[PDB]
């Protein structure tokens, strides 16, 4: 799929993720969700190659929940995104390689912060303020590194992902027929209806 | 006694216990008869039923169009060893475009049957087989034993009672012999042979089975109404 | 064919016991007796060449050998097993360690990697356990001088000096007499012949005693010049006429 | 009872089944007996045809591994045969992967490991044989290699195996102890043949015809076994002196 | 006790009791025998007719290897024909690989491997028959017997089966009275003269004769059956002789 | 074949018990004690060598207690070249664990692995079971100071003071009675070596019969340090307690 | 690999190994399963031979294998960790290819199953466990509670009992529960559910553990505390 | 020991003959064929009053057209009831039609001799298969561990089976009507069963033509049971 | 580089009557611009009066034919000499082409 972007702020991280499905020259669906809940405090975003996006997402869910089950216990977002990034970097030496990028947003219950990690398909692991996958960064991190500080609200937040947005949406060839919000904080997980 | 708990153990007079005992479950099967001409093979078996609601358990199969064969013993180890004939002479057929000879099919069975007597772990198979067919060279009629042993004969007997039935062919042997071109006569002295063997019973219409194969008669079994005419 | 025996052939009896490994103990002490002394610069390992037949040449039939240049080891027991450990303890210090490192295993953990056979022929199937007992000495840089003690269970354990087989416990009480920790390597190599003329019967002499040292770098036995890091082996055999040398100030 | 059927270890710390494997060894009712000449390894064999039906060509314990090395077997044929094979096999493919000729000893301990795997997994049989293995070394020089179904191996001067292996044994300790050397000092094969021929008819007390012996002859890069008149002319020369 | 339980067990003999235990299957088969002559090999067979209604000639027991070994075998027939199948496998791959047809020593040694690897191990049975074989190859005539053991030996005449002794006697007569050698038309009416005199042990049942034949001049080096009149010359010189 | 001669290690016996399991732990039973003692601020592992020797070099010597990192130890009870095997097998599992979360090994996580291993032998496979039984002590950060043990039947559970080896129902009753939950870390080494000095077949306890280690957070701020202690400082550790 | 056939029939038919992993269960502590009107109860004994324990960390009876299916067992707890582990897969396993949770009745045909294979493969003994298992279907408020064992064989129950002295329990359960007219609430079937266990617990200090099941993913352990009330309950009732 | 695939010295393997005698313990099934349908019975046999006798399934379906009833050690039957509906639904992929119930039955009882040292016992469980098909109508078979199949025109297995099978052989007739087999399998399931037969503790089930494999309703078994006693009053 | 495939040519014709059906093929065998022969049968009796015909590459087509003749033996055998019908037997030959679904049977089959 297209564009996905991710940003953490004082007390919560929000990813967006458009909402177009294309196969051929026709937009199948406008209302696509490229997420997944790996845990209730842990978040996770992806975009890539037809199928294996999904495929790859609801195996990473389905090992989490299985961890949860058998400690009762959730798992960090450093290590989850750790699980993560080894199955990736597992992959990309495979026969048939996951073509998978992917955000991770989640909010440290022991800690108390919130983190966002980029992981691409080759298994590159890295911990941002904000982050991107493919093109959209091209675009977007302009805005987020004039703009972006530690300790915005989750409202401040979400104007800077509203920006970036209508950047996209001004110089993108392609349209992504919009973005579904997302926040991940103490609370757990979110969706904004409006946006 | 300290020689018969495995197939692969040998006793101090060199008999082989496992291997009787699957002779053994032959005999206790129920009788059936097999002769030949020169032109026909026959053979005629009496089926055995659990009890009055029960149906006639089957004792005759097919492997081709040119050959088959009938069981005494566990019905389960025939099924194995008539899927394998049935399996060789269709790789006969596909390869070689051509059909399978009768002695040739009794080698393989013994060879199979062999490997089961040698070896740790497995059993010896629990069934005898009257193997007739229609070759190149004739009619034919083959005795299989667990054992291994295959033998070619003019006519012969296997199940309980069976040596009544081949005492009588081995008198009949130089009448039966000549019946060329003549089924019904062949079946008729086929029955009369089975005949001998029965005590307390006799051959009803859904008790009798029947198979015969020829010059141009496919491997084909009579049941039911059609032996009718033969009781 | 096929291996049919996937079983354990040594299994825990009521009392507690593994009669396998017992067993193999109790042909451990049937065994010619062997010996080690560890001294400050070095450390000595002994045996007698117990030979069947006067007409076998026992020089072809070695009982301490070396398994690394700085490791040597002798035996109690089934000769035929320790050979075959001495096959596998070769081979293991390079595949297990110096193909990976670069360098030759310290004595420690080759002894764990010898103990860690002896302990699967233990409990792995359709096998018996090694029907010896290894003494191997050695030396590394950063743990210095070493002697271990290896049983058929797979168990080891490091000694200043120890005995095996038949006359060991005689043996190991002439030994807590003689040690202490200010033995050069030439005290301990008097101690050893010593301590050996006790357990036998016959001659004794060069060709009867096998015995050999962890010692100084042999620079002369390297076989090549040109590489001041590599200094030779510590490893080395006493000859038949270096072992009568020290018979005549005995 | 279990312990003296396959081989685990007894109480006593014994291997039944080698011990018995052993036994075997002497079923045959043959002795044999090996020497070292100066060029040379000498060994001869007991041969027994008691069967007239028998063709007396193909009875042989004595067997050619390879080029260089010569091997006679103590023990049931089938068994020798099977030790041949493997030994054959096992020459071939050491020349094949090292390029030179597998020297006797290593042949020896390599039949050795073998058998010592037969005393320790138990789905295996020893071999109820005692291989003795013989060459002109191109290092070690004249060379004799005996192995048991113990798994055990040693280098000998020389050696005797069968039912009146101590009888022999003992004749050649009291040779080699007076000449305190060891080795036959002599420059030809055939008079170290003589030498091996006499001392066993000495020690056992028995005259021998051409057809009643066996002899194989190691040189340096050759193994060769004699034919029956080879062995008379040397009954003559030592009937002659 | 309990030695005998198990294959490959030694006895504190030393020996092998189901290995011995087998030869008695083998001393209970019929008779065969094998005579080596001057350019070739003879090899005959006791079939005993349990029955009129076996059909004559028909069950063959002689078996040809390659085109020029034949074999035969008494005891448990099934475990002669297993080796059998062995043996043809094992001539097919020399040929394969050398180009040559099996010498009869290697093809020997073959057959000897194989029936010596089931005495090593307890999860297999030895083999229920004793087997003489042989044929022509580049060196001449070859005449082998084969035990249950994995023994074997050349042989100038064979015999095994349960008339062996009766057997053995006369080809020792043959041997004494020939030693310039035996030709092969001979060596055919002598083999079943032997046969018929062997019978004697099995006189209870009447029987049947089967005799084959490798030789150089008589049928070009390759196994043969012998058939029609020579069968016929050869039974009727056999019951002259009883007679 | 060769059905005549296996054992049959993997089966119930009339009564529902495992013979092999039950055999095993009888071994044990005769194995040196080894006693573990969990505190607020820490846990200590205390554990007996069988029958030494003048001549045995202790310093370099180790049979009883084991590293699996650095958070975690272990005390052996058993066959130790079978606790060696597992030992290396619990090393491993730690490594795999930190190298695809990034954090260490929950101590649980670790025995429930090893205790896995153990059962799998008393099910499957016709092999005979390790005779050992370990003693965990370990720390991670979601229950703190944790000890456990683990037997032959792959069974494992939780413990405030424990003992396992020799004399075990003589031991345990000692611990039941001086113990405190509110106790301190060198109250609990004082108790251990009691214990040990009570129970012990020997006529006297010395510092060569002995093996020590504690885990303490007494460790410069938040953070665990090992202390596997040396010769020397068993012989200081007896004289403070006031045994020798 | 070992193949050797350890569960086989006897003379009288019957398969001695399966015979015998029951006894294993016998021996086992108690454990007994109560279901509501709109609820299901786990109890479970814990012997107080074992003091000095640390209950934080001691692996506890009553496991979850799904976030609205429980199970408890009776028996060997090695082995009863196996099935529990195996069940956890195999509810994660159905997820991913159906999208919808296991329903109580297909988590138990595969428990089950899972133990049926353990009595008819080669080289391996049957579980010496018996288990329940418990919970809501999903958008079902009909609870749901199953008993396996060793042999394999399953079935639905209203109320039941596993372990040492469940001969017991079970009597005091086939009396006292009524299937007209089942514990309407949580208070009523948790009462039932200790009452039954005070018959065989000796005392009810630590050695009872509860755990109650809602409908909806609802579930939760009590504490010593709010058990030690219902047996302070209990027996002020039963002096009169 | 001794091996699991031995013969006695009679020619019978132990272990299959062995597992007759445990079905021989389990619950009592009735089956019996009429030219209006198959009907199939079972004793449900409850080890407690708490136990959800609904939950207890010793009638399965397999097919549309093809039941099964079993007894003896149940919890072996459901790897042979996968194995049968698996066969039944792939010849329907491979042949777009129905499988005979011959054919069908001989599929599971390939399964029965399939042990060795494969699983390691033979199955301690009887199966009564029932069904029908266009070739030879209704049907009813009687699949044991040994591997053979018998047909029946009427049969019971379990623990009132030679009872039952005595009391079948004067009852049956080849003009026997749906209702009046139903009735009849409710009467011997009585006359066997220790505790007294209800609705809760005895299930009946049929397969017709028309309407193909039905297991009946608690209520609709209870307006035969008491249709059943009427008529045994009558006379 | 080796080529497995080839085209031998021909046509077939299947036309269903109420009561009736025929299936018809030229007899001609051709590679490239060469006749390898004037009469080479293409449409074939395959029992239980089914006729069948694989056009395309012979070898293939022989090969298809020769399974199916096959296959309806085996009917016979495993469900009691019953007869094969026509969707049964379109059914089963689905299932005989899709088994080489990455390395086909170069042919156009009708019954
Ligand atoms: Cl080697
Ligand atoms: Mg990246
Ligand atoms: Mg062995």
């Given at each position: ?195 | ?231 | ?250 | ?241 | ?65 390659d085109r020029h070994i034949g074999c035969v075998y008494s005891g448990l027939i099934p475990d002669g024909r297993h080796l059998v199948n062995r043996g043809r496998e094992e001539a097919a791959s020399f040929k394969k690989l050398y180009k040559t047809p099996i010498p009869i020593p290697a093809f020997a040694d073959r057959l000897g491997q194989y029936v010596q690897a089931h005495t090593l191990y307890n999860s297999v049975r030895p083999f229920g028959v004793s087997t003489i074989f042989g044929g022509v190859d580049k060196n001449g005539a070859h005449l082998y017997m084969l035990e249950p053991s994995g023994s074997y030996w050349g042989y100038k005449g064979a015999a095994t089966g349960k008339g062996r002794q009766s057997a053995k006697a006369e080809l020792e007569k043959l041997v004494d009275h020939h030693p310039e050698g035996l030709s092969a038309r001979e060596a055919v009416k002598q083999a079943a003269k032997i046969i018929y005199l062997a019978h004697e042990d099995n006189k209870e049942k009447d029987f049947e004769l089967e ?33 | ?244 | ?240 | ?235 | ?111």
């Open positions: 799929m297209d564009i996905i972007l991710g940003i953490r702020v004082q007390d919560s991280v929000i990813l967006a993720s458009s909402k177009a499905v294309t196969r051929g020259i026709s937009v199948l669906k406008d209302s696509d969700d490229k997420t997944r809940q790996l845990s209730p405090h842990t978040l996770m975003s992806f975009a890539g190659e037809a199928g294996d996006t999904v495929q790859f997402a609801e195996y990473i869910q389905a090992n989490i929940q299985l961890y949860s089950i058998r400690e009762d216990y959730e798992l960090s977002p450093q290590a989850v995104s750790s699980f993560v990034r080894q199955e990736l970097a597992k992959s990309i030496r495979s026969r048939r390689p996951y073509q998978v990028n992917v955000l991770i947003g989640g909010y440290d219950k022991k800690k108390n912060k919130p983190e966002l990690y980029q992981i691409d398909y080759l298994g590159t692991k890295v911990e941002l303020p904000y982050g991107a996958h493919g093109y959209s960064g091209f675009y977007t991190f302009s805005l987020l590194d004039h703009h972006y500080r530690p300790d915005m609200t989750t409202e401040e937040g979400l104007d800077l992902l509203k920006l970036c947005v209508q950047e996209l949406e001004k110089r993108m060839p392609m349209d992504f027929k919009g973005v579904i919000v997302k926040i991940v904080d103490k609370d757990g997980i979110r969706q904004v209806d409006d946006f | 006694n300290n020689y018969d708990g495995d197939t692969v153990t040998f006793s101090p007079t060199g008999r082989l216990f496992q291997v009787e005992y699957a002779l053994e479950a032959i005999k206790q099967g129920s009788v059936t008869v097999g002769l030949r001409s020169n032109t026909h093979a026959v053979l005629v078996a009496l089926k055995r039923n659990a009890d009055e609601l029960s149906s006639y358990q089957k004792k005759i199969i097919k492997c081709d169009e040119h050959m088959g064969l009938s069981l005494a013993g566990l019905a389960p180890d025939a099924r194995v060893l008539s899927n394998y004939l049935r399996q060789q002479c269709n790789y006969s057929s596909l390869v070689f475009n051509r059909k399978l000879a009768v002695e040739r099919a009794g080698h393989l069975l013994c060879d199979k049957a062999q490997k089961n007597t040698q070896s740790y772990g497995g059993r010896p198979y629990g069934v005898g087989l009257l193997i007739i067919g229609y070759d190149k060279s004739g009619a034919h009629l083959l005795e299989f034993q667990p054992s291994g042993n295959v033998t070619e004969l003019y006519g012969t007997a296997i199940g309980a009672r069976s040596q009544g039935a081949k005492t009588y062919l081995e008198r009949t042997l130089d009448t039966f012999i000549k019946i060329d071109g003549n089924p019904d006569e062949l079946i008729k002295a086929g029955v009369e042979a089975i005949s001998q063997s029965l005590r307390d019973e006799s051959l009803t219409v859904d008790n009798l089975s029947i198979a015969i194969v020829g010059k141009d008669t496919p491997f084909t079994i009579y049941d039911g109404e059609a032996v009718a005419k033969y009781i | 064919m096929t291996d049919r025996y996937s079983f354990s052939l040594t299994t825990f009896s009521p009392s507690g016991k593994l009669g396998q490994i017992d067993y193999a103990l109790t042909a451990v002490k049937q065994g010619v007796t062997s010996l080690g002394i560890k001294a400050t610069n070095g450390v000595v390992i002994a045996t007698e060449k117990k030979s069947s037949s006067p007409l076998a040449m026992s020089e072809t039939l070695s009982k301490v050998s070396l398994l690394t240049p700085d490791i040597g080891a002798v035996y109690s027991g089934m000769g035929p097993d320790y050979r075959v450990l001495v096959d596998k303890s070769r081979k293991v210090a390079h595949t297990s360690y110096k193909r990976i490192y670069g360098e030759y295993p310290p004595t420690k953990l080759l002894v764990s990697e010898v103990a860690k056979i002896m302990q699967e022929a233990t409990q792995s199937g359709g096998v018996r356990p090694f029907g010896v007992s290894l003494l191997i000495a050695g030396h590394d840089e950063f743990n210095g001088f070493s002697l271990y003690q290896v049983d058929p269970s797979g168990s080891y354990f490091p000694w200043k000096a120890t005995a095996i087989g038949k006359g060991s416990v005689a043996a190991k009480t002439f030994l807590e007499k003689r040690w202490n920790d200010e033995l050069e390597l030439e005290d301990a190599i008097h101690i050893a012949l010593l301590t050996l003329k006790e357990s036998v019967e016959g001659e004794f002499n060069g060709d009867t005693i096998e015995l050999a040292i962890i010692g100084d770098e042999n620079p002369d036995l390297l076989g090549y010049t040109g590489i001041p890091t590599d200094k030779g082996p510590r490893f080395r055999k006493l000859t038949s006429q270096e072992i009568n040398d020290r018979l005549e100030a005995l | 009872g279990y312990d003296r059927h396959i081989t685990i270890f007894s109480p006593e710390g014994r291997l039944y089944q080698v011990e018995y494997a052993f036994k075997a060894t002497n079923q045959t009712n043959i002795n044999s007996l090996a020497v070292r000449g100066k060029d040379c390894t000498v060994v001869i064999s007991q041969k027994k045809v008691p069967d007239k039906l028998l063709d007396p060509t193909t009875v042989s314990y004595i067997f050619c591994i390879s080029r260089t090395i010569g091997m006679v077997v103590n023990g049931p044929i089938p068994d020798a045969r099977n030790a041949a094979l493997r030994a054959k096999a096992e020459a071939a493919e050491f020349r094949y992967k090292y390029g030179y000729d597998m020297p006797c000893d290593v042949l020896a301990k390599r039949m050795a490991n073998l058998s010592q795997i037969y005393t320790q997994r138990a789905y295996m049989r020893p071999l109820g044989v005692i291989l003795t293995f013989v060459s002109v070394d191109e290092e070690l020089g004249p060379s004799i290699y005996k192995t048991d179904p113990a798994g055990y191996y040693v280098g000998y001067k020389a050696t005797a195996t069968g039912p009146k292996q101590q009888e022999i044994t003992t004749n050649l300790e009291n040779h080699f102890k007076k000449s305190k050397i060891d080795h036959i000092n002599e420059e030809s094969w055939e008079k170290v043949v003589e030498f091996a021929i006499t001392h066993m008819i000495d020690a056992l007390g028995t005259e021998f015809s051409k057809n009643d012996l066996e002899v194989g002859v190691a040189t340096k890069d050759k193994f060769f076994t004699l034919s029956a008149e080879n062995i008379e002319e040397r009954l003559v020369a030592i009937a002659e002196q | 006790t309990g030695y005998d339980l198990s294959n490959s067990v030694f006895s504190p003999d030393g020996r092998n009791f189901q290995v011995e235990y087998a030869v008695k299957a083998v001393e209970n088969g019929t008779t065969s025998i094998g005579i080596k002559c001057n350019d070739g090999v003879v090899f005959a067979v006791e079939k005993l007719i349990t029955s009129k209604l076996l059909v004559p000639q028909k069950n063959v027991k002689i078996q040809v290897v005799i084959s034949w490798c030789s150089l001049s008589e049928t070009n080096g390759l196994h043969k059956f012998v058939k029609g009149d020579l069968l016929q010359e050869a039974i009727d010189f056999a019951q002259k002789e009883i007679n | 074949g060769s059905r005549r001669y296996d054992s049959r290690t993997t089966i119930f016996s009339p009564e529902g018990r495992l013979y092999q399991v039950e055999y095993a732990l009888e071994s044990i039973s005769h194995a040196g004690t080894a006693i573990g003692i969990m505190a607020s601020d820490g846990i200590v592992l205390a554990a007996e060598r069988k029958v030494t020797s003048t001549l045995l070099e202790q310093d370099t010597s180790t049979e009883k207690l084991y590293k699996l990192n650095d958070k975690i130890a272990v005390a052996v009870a058993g066959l130790t070249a079978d606790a060696e095997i597992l030992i290396n097998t619990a090393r491993i599992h730690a490594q795999n664990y930190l190298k695809t979360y990034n954090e260490d090994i929950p101590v649980e996580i670790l025995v429930r692995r090893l205790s896995d291993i153990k059962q799998g032998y008393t099910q499957h496979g016709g092999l005979r079971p390790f005779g050992v039984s370990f003693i965990y002590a370990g720390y991670d950060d979601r229950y703190g100071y944790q000890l456990y043990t683990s037997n032959p039947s792959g069974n494992y559970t939780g413990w405030k003071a424990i003992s396992v080896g020799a004399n075990t129902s003589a031991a345990q009753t000692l611990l039941q009675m001086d113990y405190k939950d509110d106790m301190k870390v060198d109250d609990a080494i004082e108790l251990a070596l009691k214990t040990l000095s009570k129970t012990t077949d020997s006529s006297a306890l010395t510092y060569d019969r002995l093996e020590f280690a504690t885990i303490r957070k007494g460790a410069n701020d938040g953070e665990v340090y090992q202390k596997i202690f040396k010769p020397q400082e068993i012989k200081d550790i007896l004289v403070k307690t006031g045994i020798t | 690999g070992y193949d050797r056939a350890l569960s086989i029939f006897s003379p009288d038919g019957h398969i001695f190994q399966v015979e015998y992993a029951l006894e294993a269960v016998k021996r086992g502590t108690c454990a007994v399963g109560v279901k509501g009107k709109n609820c299901v109860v786990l109890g479970c004994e814990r012997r107080s031979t074992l003091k000095l324990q640390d209950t934080r960390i001691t692996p506890s009876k009553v496991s979850k294998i799904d976030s609205h299916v429980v199970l408890s067992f009776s028996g060997l707890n090695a082995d009863s960790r196996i099935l529990i582990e195996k069940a956890r897969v195999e509810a994660q396993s159905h997820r991913l290819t159906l999208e919808d949770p296991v329903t109580v009745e297909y988590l138990t045909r595969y428990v089950a199953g899972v133990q049926q294979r353990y009595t008819q493969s080669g080289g391996v003994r049957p579980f010496g466990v018996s288990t329940l298992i418990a919970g809501f279907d999903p958008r079902d408020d009909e609870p749901k509670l199953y008993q396996t064992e060793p042999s394999g064989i399953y079935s639905s129950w209203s109320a039941q009992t596993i372990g040492r002295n469940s001969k017991t329990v079970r009597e005091f359960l086939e009396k006292n529960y009524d299937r007209k007219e089942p514990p309407a609430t949580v208070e009523e079937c948790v009462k039932l559910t200790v009452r039954s266990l005070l018959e065989v617990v000796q005392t009810g200090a630590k050695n009872i553990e509860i755990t109650v099941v809602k409908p909806d993913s609802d579930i939760v352990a009590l504490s010593s505390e709010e058990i030690n009330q219902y047996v302070t309950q209990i027996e002020q009732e039963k002096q009169e | 020991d001794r091996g699991v695939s031995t013969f006695s010295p009679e020619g019978r393997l132990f272990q299959v003959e062995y597992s007759l005698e445990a079905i021989k313990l389990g619950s009592t099934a009735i089956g019996i064929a009429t030219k209006e349908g198959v009907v199939l019975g079972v004793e449900k046999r409850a080890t407690s009053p708490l136990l959800e006798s609904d939950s207890i399934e010793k009638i399965v379906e397999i097919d549309r057209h093809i039941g099964c009833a079993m007894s003896g050690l149940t919890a072996d039957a459901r790897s042979m009831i996968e194995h049968a509906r698996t066969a039944a639904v792939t010849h329907n992929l491979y042949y777009d039609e129905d499988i005979n119930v011959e054919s069908l039955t001989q599929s599971v009882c390939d399964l029965a001799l399939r042990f060795g040292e494969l699983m390691s016992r033979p199955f301690g469980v009887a199966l009564l298969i029932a069904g029908h098909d266009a070739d030879d109508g209704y049907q009813l078979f009687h699949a044991e561990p040994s591997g053979t199949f018998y047909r029946y025109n009427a049969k019971a297995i379990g623990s009132g089976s030679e009872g039952a099978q005595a009391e079948l052989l004067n009852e049956w007739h080849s003009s026997l009507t749906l209702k009046e087999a139903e009735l009849l399998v409710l009467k011997i399931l009585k006359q066997v069963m220790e505790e007294k037969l209800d609705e809760n503790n005895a299930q009946l089930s049929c397969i017709t033509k028309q309407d193909g494999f039905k297991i009946y309703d608690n209520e609709k078994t209870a307006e035969l049971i008491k249709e059943l006693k009427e008529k045994e009053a009558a006379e | 580089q080796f080529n497995p495939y080839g085209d031998n040519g021909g046509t077939i014709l299947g036309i269903a009557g109420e009561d009736f059906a025929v299936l018809a093929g030229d007899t001609r065998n051709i590679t490239d611009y060469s006749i390898n022969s004037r009469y080479e049968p293409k449409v074939f009796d395959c029992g239980d009066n089914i006729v069948m015909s694989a056009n395309g590459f012979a070898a293939d087509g022989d090969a298809l034919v020769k399974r199916f003749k096959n296959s309806v033996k085996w009917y016979h055998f495993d469900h009691n000499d019953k007869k094969l019908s026509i969707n049964s037997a379109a059914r089963n030959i689905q299932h005989l082409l899709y088994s080489r679904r990455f390395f086909p049977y170069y042919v156009y089959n009708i019954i």
